[PDB]
Amino acid sequence: SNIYAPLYAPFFGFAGCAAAMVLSCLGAAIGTAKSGIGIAGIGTFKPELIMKSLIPVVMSGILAIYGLVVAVLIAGNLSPTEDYTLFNGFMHLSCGLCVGFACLSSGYAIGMVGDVGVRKYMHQPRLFVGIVLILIFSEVLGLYGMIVALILNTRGS
Amino acid sequence: EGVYFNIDNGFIEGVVRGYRNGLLSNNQYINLTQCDTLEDLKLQLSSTDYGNFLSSVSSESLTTSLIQEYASSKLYHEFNYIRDQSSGSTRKFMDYITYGYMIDNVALMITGTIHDRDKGEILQRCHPLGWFDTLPTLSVATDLESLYETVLVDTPLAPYFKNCFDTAEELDDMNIEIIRNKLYKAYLEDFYNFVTEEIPEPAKECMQTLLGFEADRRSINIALNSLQSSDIDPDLKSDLLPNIGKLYPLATFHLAQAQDFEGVRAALANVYEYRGFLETGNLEDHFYQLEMELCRDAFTQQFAISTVWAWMKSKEQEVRNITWIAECIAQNQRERINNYISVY
Amino acid sequence: LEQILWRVLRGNLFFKTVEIEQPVYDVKTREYKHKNAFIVFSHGDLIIKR
Amino acid sequence: KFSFSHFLYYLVLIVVIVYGLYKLFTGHGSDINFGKFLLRTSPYMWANLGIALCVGLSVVGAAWGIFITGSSMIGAGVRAPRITTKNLISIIFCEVVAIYGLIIAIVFSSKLTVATAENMYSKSNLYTGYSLFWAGITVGASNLICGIAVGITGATAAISDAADSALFVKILVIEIFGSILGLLGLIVGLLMAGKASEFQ
Amino acid sequence: DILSSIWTEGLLMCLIVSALLLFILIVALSWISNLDITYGALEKSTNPIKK
Amino acid sequence: MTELCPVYAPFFGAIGCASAIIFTSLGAAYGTAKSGVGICATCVLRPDLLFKNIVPVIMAGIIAIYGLVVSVLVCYSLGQKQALYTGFIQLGAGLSVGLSGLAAGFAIGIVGDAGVRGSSQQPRLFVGMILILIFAEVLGLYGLIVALLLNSRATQDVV
Amino acid sequence: MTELCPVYAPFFGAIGCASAIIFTSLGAAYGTAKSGVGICATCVLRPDLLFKNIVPVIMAGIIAIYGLVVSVLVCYSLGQKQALYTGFIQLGAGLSVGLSGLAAGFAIGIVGDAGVRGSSQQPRLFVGMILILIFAEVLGLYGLIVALLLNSRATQDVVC
Amino acid sequence: MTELCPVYAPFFGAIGCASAIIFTSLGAAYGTAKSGVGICATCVLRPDLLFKNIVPVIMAGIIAIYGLVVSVLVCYSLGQKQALYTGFIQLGAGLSVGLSGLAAGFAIGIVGDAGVRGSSQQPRLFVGMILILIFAEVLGLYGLIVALLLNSRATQDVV
Amino acid sequence: MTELCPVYAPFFGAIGCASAIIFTSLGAAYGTAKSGVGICATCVLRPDLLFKNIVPVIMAGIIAIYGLVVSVLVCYSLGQKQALYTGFIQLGAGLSVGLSGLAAGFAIGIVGDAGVRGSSQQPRLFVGMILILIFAEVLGLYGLIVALLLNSRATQDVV
Amino acid sequence: MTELCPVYAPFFGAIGCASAIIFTSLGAAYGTAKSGVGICATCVLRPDLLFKNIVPVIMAGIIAIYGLVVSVLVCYSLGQKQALYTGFIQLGAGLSVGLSGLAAGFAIGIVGDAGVRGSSQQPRLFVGMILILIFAEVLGLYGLIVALLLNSRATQDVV
Amino acid sequence: YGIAQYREINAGLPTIVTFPFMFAIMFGDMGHGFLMTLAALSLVLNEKKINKMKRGEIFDMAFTGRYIILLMGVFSMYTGFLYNDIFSKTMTIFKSGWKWPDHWKKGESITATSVGTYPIGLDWAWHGTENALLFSNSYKMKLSILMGFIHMTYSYFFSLANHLYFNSMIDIIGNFIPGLLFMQGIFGYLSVCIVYKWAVDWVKDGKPAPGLLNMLINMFLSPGTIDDELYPHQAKVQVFLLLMALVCIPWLLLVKPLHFEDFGDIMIHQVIHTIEFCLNCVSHTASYLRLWALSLAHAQLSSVLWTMTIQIAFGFRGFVGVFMTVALFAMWFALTCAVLVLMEGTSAMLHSLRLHWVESMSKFFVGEGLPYEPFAFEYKDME
């Protein structure tokens, strides 16, 4: 075996996909779930507004879609039949931990603000365009995790 | 977050939401509004979740007293049902809700001393939810240090008597009014302290807001009451006003130097958050309206334990509307029927 | 009843109790309610009234 | 201290730093090696608990979730008995998450065979050893947090079904979309371990 | 080609699976220490005003 | 000792059969605990509800039977001269059925507890809580059948 | 020593014999603790019941002697020349009956407390109340029957 | 490998670009979280104040790209044959801007929450509102300029 | 590498330089946090007291750039082949001004809100308030004046 | 080099110059923290007595400069090839005066605010209040006496 | 679960046969079914006097379901004859079986070959060895997938029974067929794969037996690269099938709200429905491993109970033993009749209820309605 390519490289490579996936799904979960607390709260008062109320959860589930396509891309680059470097092995853990915390943070923020955003949305109609604007600045924190990770994946191959 | 809530409080918060949506809607009262007599008030009230509780009450003998009594009674058995199942955090919380009331019980009881009124019926006129097992307090010779040993050592009101003993021989109506506001002050210090240190996270701030309001409601009401008929020192006024409301830590001292109603509008001027006393015939209307729209927000937290504290104060608010309806019908006061207030 | 009565007499009380077998109903609780007979002792005139 | 738990974390942290630093100054960075640990150990023990932990705490996620929404279901069932059979679908999206952890375990067991005394530490079976481990904590913990989410949203669906039963079909949308990430954690599990061979 | 024989022996992987098994043990014993008995059902008072 | 069969291979078997019972027995206890305190709470007012509300502590007891019968089977597979391959699958079986059992044990406890106090108020729901609570068993049984599927691989190729 | 029977093997054997009694005695302590406050609270108003409703406390002792009868039996298997295979089983035998033993201790602990108060208000509960804790008490009997199977295997199969 | 260039050297490089984001992302998200709850609360009465109050959210966004522009830049410096020295100072640049971003993220959030509800009663507060908040934001500028100063020192005179 | 300048020597220099910024920022942010919310609370009653009350967050700004001046200074000293002696004492300079800057960060923050709310009632207070803040801030400058002495000892002696 | 003077000796010294400040500065900041809440609380009523009430705060500066005067003195003892014996006592001097300032800083902090609140109501208190915190300050000076005496032990008879 | 709406396909006539037969897989022993039927047979013949008698609380659901127990025992007796399990003991009835080699040594590797195949169900030869558990559950999971998918399509084929009767050929024929070829397209091939590879002889004709479920996942992940060679024209039809399922996913959501135009209600209403239905097929077909797992758990749990209780006392002991047989049988039969019948019975009857509910009623029930609920004058007194 080459010196630059030891035999324990599949450990860190498969550490990356694991960390990229489940931490993404953690952010996507509580991003969705904490908002649904607020959604079902005012559903008792106002039956109507729910068709505008599913915008926090569909923006929450897209983080798992980010977390998936970063995980499906880096996997499949790994097989027994070819030897890949430890240098390429570490960066999948780097790519993995990068997206995993980023859209977790995006999940946290739009979880809690998506909770309180539709919470007192029953009082006024017009604050909708405001709260959907700050969700866009809140969502791109998970988009910032990917756009470096795709750059981080294409290094060392 | 909200994950560890349903270990204990799952069933209780589940069933209270059942008790929530059985409250009367806004068109519900309008249906009750058109009722001409009390059997009309009886049968048409049975359309809601209350009904069949007026079974076996009477054959054409109904008063506002009887209507209020059973509608209160069906709450209190049911409140003792939801207090029946609770764990350590929830139980002593819900006991603190009970401790919140029972200071009113001892105040009403010592009030019966100077009137020499009958012992047997004063607790009958009193409130059954606030209750402590040892009630000799009226029958004993009432001196505050002799009354001290019974009320303090046994009952949980032990921490709440501090620097409270002044002219212990007299027991004036005004002096027993002093000690209860001192007791309310000492209570709300403790109860705010409790939800600060030990309660879950989404149920902190909604409770802190809602309870802090009640401190503020207590504060400005006793401010007006001291203003009208009493003459005391600002340091005496500052003891009656709890600081734990914290919507105004500063204006409490500014309340203390207010000896006139122009002073108290100036004392509540610089806050500007809420307006009572703004040219309104019914001052308590503003309080109860603001209270319910707070409790409206309280039910919009799903995993809070603060739902029940909103819920109790919500349901006692509609029963006095029911009392208001039944009073206006039998005594033929038609114009003020529509002064009922409910958000739901 | 005892622990309040010990404080109001400041320790020098004489107390004894005698139990009740087959206790009796009443109107208010409609229920078999256990009882005890009690005897206290004092020399003070208004004290016994208290 | 004021708390025995958080002091232990501070105590276990500082001794690791000191011990690791002590080996550094004395010249031995080789006596502590995470790389040699990965090769010396058995490739079975990674793969084996990977099978065990995945199906293990996928069950925990399903169990903890139905613990949440089950209590809220029977809570509002005191007023309305109509809910529990109509909202019975809520716990199914909680329970099927455990099936996903099961079918991971039946497809991983086909990878699990015996090896010779030689070729234990060849790259082939070493790959598939670490594969089933990391796929294991991937899909299992994914099924864990899915149970967290779908449970508490299913809880909200119960008390929101007590009034306005026409709203109930609008509030299942977050639940079916919540169960997506459970299935997404599933498919990435088969994707990553599917390239892996069996133990030769 | 071998790790250190005293603490770094291949018995270390025999030590970690007992640590994980103790980890989910001691978090589970937190739950069985947590629960309360809800005494309110068990004893009932006189309550002269209600009945 | 040997490269195929070291001497610390029986550790994972002895701890595997140990963990198989004690984790489920904790869950079966906590399942019995909260459901038992609920039964003692709710039937002090209503006598006739005693026998039909006993079904959570009956169903919690099955979880110990699940953890036992897997622990019995790996005990017959132990030996001193034992492969490291068959060593871990016994521990792999043991914790799998183990922590599934307590998780199922935790579920039967609370849903049994909320069940029996709910059954006094609404007599319709005791059919409905049994409908929910049977799901709280069989996910613990899912931990059993994976332990059986791993145990099938034990005696075939021991080498 | 050999490869099969090292010198540090009875360390797992000795603490296993300790773990058999200790965790059951903690279970017996906890079971007697909260049932003890259960008895002494509710029977001071109703004294005649004390011979009847004490059966949580005595069945707390029953899981204690479960932990003893394994521990006296694994004591006869100890020796200096023993295999590590024998040392591992005695570790498994102790923790099985031990940690399951305290689970029975926690279980009938609160059930005994909650049972005896409800039996004071309603005498119909006591006939049903002991039927709950039997299903919790057989959990400790399960911990014995697993450890009994391991101890039968420990000395028999050892080659050395 | 080389004693100057071992094979485990880019581990410090890979974590350096990794940690640059995760403390910045948790920093920026917590800032816009506590500011976000403030804006929606203060706008339920006196509406149509929106575009004046988004500056705490926007300045929470600006620290995020501060974390990105450094991490993508040190990713261009990563290499398989790189020195063990170069792996450290990009991790040094990684931890610098990362933790300072999380530090400023706390600062933006708590000032945003208590700030914007204050602007409802006092419309004159807003001139001080950006002035109080940039002194939280220039902290995020400080972590960047020290990190980009380190990344210039990366390849310079390295064997 | 060699015994006097091994390859793990810049590790202490890199995170030593990293420790300079991230502690003095987190100090400055915590200082700006509780004092800034003191500004927003007290300015809703009256606007005019803002510019007299901005002095603590200026002092929070100064204790931040104290940590910058040392970390900019240490950055020109790093290299691949530097001594391990000069590797450590810059980590000494990194921790010293770092945690002392953190210490005043605790100071100025909790003094600031108590100052600024009292400054509403009493216009005589603020003259004494800044005289309190100097003894909090000169405490922070003590970290720089000791760290500046260490960096002069870095480049002086080498192998 | 030798076993008497290895290469890792300056690590124990460089951590001494840091810990001399950072425990002292964090300690002394706590004193002005809690006394600062005391001064701001009482002087809104009684402004005149402010000038006699900075004597907790200025004494916290006196324990703060104690950490400096040892740390600049122990800084001059460092070297490339110093002995490991003289490396040990530099933290031993540092840790002594380090934590003793944290001890005494807690003392004058807690007695400070409760002291000055009493001086508001009791005008004759503060002549008695300051003399006991002197006996809290001489605790902080004791760490200086022992650290200076250990620093004399450093460079003599080294080899 | 709910009241069917007016002039709609009733779910009763499926449930008469389905609910016991779906239960019948879940344990299916001749012994346990015999005890089950016997208790039920005592109920059906005592019916004329016991309905007049007052009922207990648990006796209510039992006596009103006296037929759904009694019809159930017959099926479970049939499934027992299929599995050959009488209290975890086999049959040894037909003597066709497998052929063992003539000479071996005790404790040796002993394989066996067939002179023929067993006419009804499994045979006794798979009793003893723990490797026969591997043959058992590999079989029984494919039993689950095969019949349940047919059961799903049987429920879904009755969707057109009501839509054609509602004269809904305008719209719901555009709803039915995209739903059909999504489900029957993918999982029909996966089902018919299982049936096809059982007929193909992989031993006599030397070829590798391809992956059971490995051929499923690489259909999606790879565009028709098989490498397992199950069929020569497998590759061409696989990509054809994969596309035509994927083309129906837009073709389901587009055609129904299209009118000759939406309110905003129906476009959302379909796009929640079709995304649900996309995951519903992969979930609810895989949800039928309840049927396999509970059957696997039951028989083996009875096996070890036979092993632990009986075989201790079953060993010969002269005087104490004939008392020990009396004792441990009373410890045997008490557990296996009271616990193991009732607890696994009440467990598995609620699964086949669930299995009949959440999978079939999703295909049958398109809504709800009003019960007929007429008023009558009956003996109604309750204090």
Give the Cα separation of J77 and J87 in Å (integer): 9
Nearest residue of chain F to residue K137 (CA atoms): F149
Q: How far is CA G130 from CA B326, F54, G136, G158, J108, in A?
A: 52, 12, 10, 43, 63
Q: How far is CA D50 from CA D135, D139, F96, H16, K275, in A?
A: 7, 10, 10, 30, 31
Alpha-carbon F126 to chain mean position: 24
Nearest residue of chain E to residue G109 (CA atoms): E37
**How many CB atoms are closer than 10 A to CB K243?**
12
CB within 8 Å of chain E, chain B residues 5-64: 7-8
Alpha-carbon G75 to chain mean position: 17
Stated resolution in angstroms: 3.5
| Token reading at K358 | 């959440």
Measure in Å the smallest separation between the Cα of I117 and chain B Cα atoms: 10
What single letter denotes the amino acid at residue B117?
Answer: R
Decide: I63 and I28 in contact? Cβ < 8 Å.
yes
Nearest residue of chain D to residue F2 (CA atoms): D117
Structure solved via: cryo-EM
Decide: K286 and K187 in contact? Cβ < 8 Å.
no
| DSSP sequence for J93-149 | HHHHHHHHHHHHHHHHHHHHHHHHHHHHH-TTSHHHHHHHHHHHHHHHHHHHHHHHH
Domain boundaries, chain I: 1-159
> J95 touching I, CB under 8 A?
no
Using a CB-CB cut-off of 8 Å, the residues of chain C touching B141 are 50
Burial of F45-81, coded b for 16+ CB within 10 Å and e otherwise, reads: eeeebbebbbbbbbbbbbbbbbbbbbbbbbbbbbbbb
> E50 touching C, CB under 8 A?
no
Any contact of G with I, at least 3 CB pairs below 8 A?
no
What single letter denotes the amino acid at residue G1?
Answer: M
Nearest to J22 among I95, I110, I122 (CB): I95
Decide: D181 and D106 in contact? Cβ < 8 Å.
no
Which backbone phi and psi does H143 adopt, to 5 degrees?
A: -65, -30
Strand-strand pairing, C14-19 and C36-41: antiparallel
Question: Is K206 exposed, middle or buried, given 0-12, 13-18 or 19+ CB atoms closer than 10 A?
Answer: exposed
**How many CB atoms are closer than 10 A to CB K242?**
17
Strands (E) located in K149-280: none
**Of H74, H89, H153, which to mutate for an interface test with I (greatest number of I Cβ within 10 Å)?**
H89
**Of B16, B296, B302, B303, which to mutate for an interface test with A (greatest number of A Cβ within 10 Å)?**
B302
Q: Which of H130, H131, H58, H70 is nearest to H100 (CA)?
A: H70
Return the SS3 of K99.
strand
Q: How far is CA D57 from CA D102, H156, J70, K360, in A?
A: 11, 50, 56, 30
Give the Cα separation of E18 and E11 in Å (integer): 11
Measure in Å the smallest separation between the Cα of E8 and chain F Cα atoms: 15
Whether residues D164 and A44 touch (CB distance < 8 A) is answered with yes
Using a CB-CB cut-off of 8 Å, the residues of chain E touching G120 are 43
**Tally of residues, chain A:** 157
Q: Which of K242, K232, K240 is nearest to K200 (CA)?
A: K232
Burial of B46-58, coded b for 16+ CB within 10 Å and e otherwise, reads: eeeebeeebeeee
Give the domains, in start order, of chain D with CATH numbers: 8-193 (1.20.120.610)
| Token reading at F144 | 């059993």
CB under 8 A, 24+ apart: contacts of K238-241: K241/K185, K241/K186, K241/K189
> B8 touching D, CB under 8 A?
no
Which residues in chain I are immediately followed by a break of C to N over 2.5 Å? none
The answer to whether the Cα torsion of B23, B27, B30, B31 is positive or negative is negative
Looking at chain K, the number of H-run helices and the number of E-run strands are: 16, 0
Nearest residue of chain F to residue D72 (CA atoms): F114
| DSSP sequence for H64-84 | HHHHHHHHHHHHTT--TT--H
Which residues are registered as beta bridge partners of C11?
Answer: none
Q: Which of G120, E37, G100 is nearest to F113 (CA)?
A: E37
Q: Which of F35, F93, F30 is nearest to F66 (CA)?
A: F93
Decide: K135 and K111 in contact? Cβ < 8 Å.
no
| Token reading at K11 | 């779910």
CB within 8 Å of chain H, chain I residues 98-117: none
Helix residue ranges, H only, chain D: 4-25, 34-40, 43-76, 83-86, 89-109, 123-160, 168-171, 173-178, 180-194
Give the Cα separation of B103 and J49 in Å (integer): 42
Nearest residue of chain K to residue F134 (CA atoms): K347
Whether residues D33 and E3 touch (CB distance < 8 A) is answered with yes
Looking at chain G, the number of H-run helices and the number of E-run strands are: 4, 0
List of residues 6+ apart from K373 with CB closer than 8 A = none
Return the SS3 of C15.
strand
> B11 touching F, CB under 8 A?
yes
Q: Which of A58, F127, K351, K156 is nearest to D99 (CA)?
A: K351
Q: How far is CA K131 from CA F143, K127, K135, K136, K142, in A?
A: 20, 10, 7, 9, 18
SS3 sequence, chain B? Answer: CCCHHHHCCHHHHHHHHHHHCCCCCHHHHHHHHCCCCHHHHHHHHCCCCCCCCCCCCCCCCCCHHHHHHHHHHHHHHHHHHHHHCCCHHHHHHHHHHHHHHHHHHHHHHHHHHHCCCCHHHHHHHCCCCCCCCCCCCCCCCCCHHHHHHHHHHHCCCHHHCCCCCCCCCCCCHHHHHHHHHHHHHHHHHHHHHHHHHCCCCHHHHHHHHHHHHHHHHHHHHHHHHHHHHCCCCHHHHHHHCCHHHCCCCCHHHHHHCCCCHHHHHHHCCCCCCCCCCCCCCCHHHHHHHHHHHHHHHHCCCCCCCCHHHHHHHHHHHHHHHHHHHHHHHHCCCCHHHHHCCCCC
Burial of H104-134, coded b for 16+ CB within 10 Å and e otherwise, reads: bbbbbbbbbbbbbbbbbbbeebbebbeebbe
Residue listed under structure tokens 């046994």:
B154
List of residues 6+ apart from B205 with CB closer than 8 A = none
Which contiguous run of DSSP H or E holds residue J36? helix J10-42
Q: Is K167 left (phi over 0), alpha (psi -120 to 50) or beta?
A: left
| Token reading at A128 | 């909708």
**How many CB atoms are closer than 10 A to CB F141?**
26
Instruction: Give the CA angle between residues H123, H128, H133 to the nearest 5°.
Output: 120
Q: Which of H37, H19, H1 is nearest to H90 (CA)?
A: H19
Whether residues F110 and B14 touch (CB distance < 8 A) is answered with no
Q: Which of J97, J75, J84 is nearest to J27 (CA)?
A: J97
Give the Cα separation of K287 and B176 in Å (integer): 70
Nearest to F25 among G92, G125, G142 (CB): G142
| Token reading at G76 | 């006869």
Return the SS3 of K125.
helix
Measure in Å the smallest separation between the Cα of D64 and chain F Cα atoms: 7
> B278 touching C, CB under 8 A?
no
Q: Is B60 left (phi over 0), alpha (psi -120 to 50) or beta?
A: left
CB within 8 Å of chain A, chain D residues 72-131: 121, 123-124, 126-128, 130-131
Whether residues B302 and A40 touch (CB distance < 8 A) is answered with yes
Nearest residue of chain C to residue B147 (CA atoms): C8
Using a CB-CB cut-off of 8 Å, the residues of chain E touching F106 are 31
Whether residues F30 and E42 touch (CB distance < 8 A) is answered with no
Instruction: Give the CA angle between residues K237, K240, K244 to the nearest 5°.
Output: 140
Question: Is F86 exposed, middle or buried, given 0-12, 13-18 or 19+ CB atoms closer than 10 A?
Answer: buried
**Helix, strand, coil shares, percent, chain F, to 5:** 75, 0, 25
With an 8 Å Cβ cutoff, the interface of chain A facing chain B consists of 30, 34, 37-38, 40-42, 44-45, 119-120
Question: Is G138 exposed, middle or buried, given 0-12, 13-18 or 19+ CB atoms closer than 10 A?
Answer: middle
Give the Cα separation of H116 and A130 in Å (integer): 14
Looking at residue K113, what DSSP letter applies? Answer: B
Question: Is K251 exposed, middle or buried, given 0-12, 13-18 or 19+ CB atoms closer than 10 A?
Answer: middle
Instruction: Give the CA angle between residues B101, B28, B308 to the nearest 5°.
Output: 30
Give the Cα separation of K10 and I129 in Å (integer): 84
| Token reading at B305 | 């334990």
**Of E36, E39, E42, E51, which to mutate for an interface test with B (greatest number of B Cβ within 10 Å)?**
E36
Nearest residue of chain E to residue D49 (CA atoms): E17
| Token reading at A104 | 């977790």
> I55 touching H, CB under 8 A?
no
Give the Cα separation of B171 and B151 in Å (integer): 15
What single letter denotes the amino acid at residue B236?
Answer: L
Q: How far is CA B55 from CA B19, B49, B65, B70, in A?
A: 21, 14, 16, 11
Return the SS3 of G121.
helix
| Token reading at J28 | 């002394």
Return the SS3 of D93.
helix
Dihedral, CA of residue H95, residue H101, residue H103 and residue H106, to nearest 10: -150
Using a CB-CB cut-off of 8 Å, the residues of chain H touching I36 are 107, 110-111, 114-115, 132, 136
> B88 touching E, CB under 8 A?
yes
Give the Cα separation of F28 and G136 in Å (integer): 8
Which residues in chain B are immediately followed by a break of C to N over 2.5 Å? none
Which residues are registered as beta bridge partners of C39?
Answer: C16
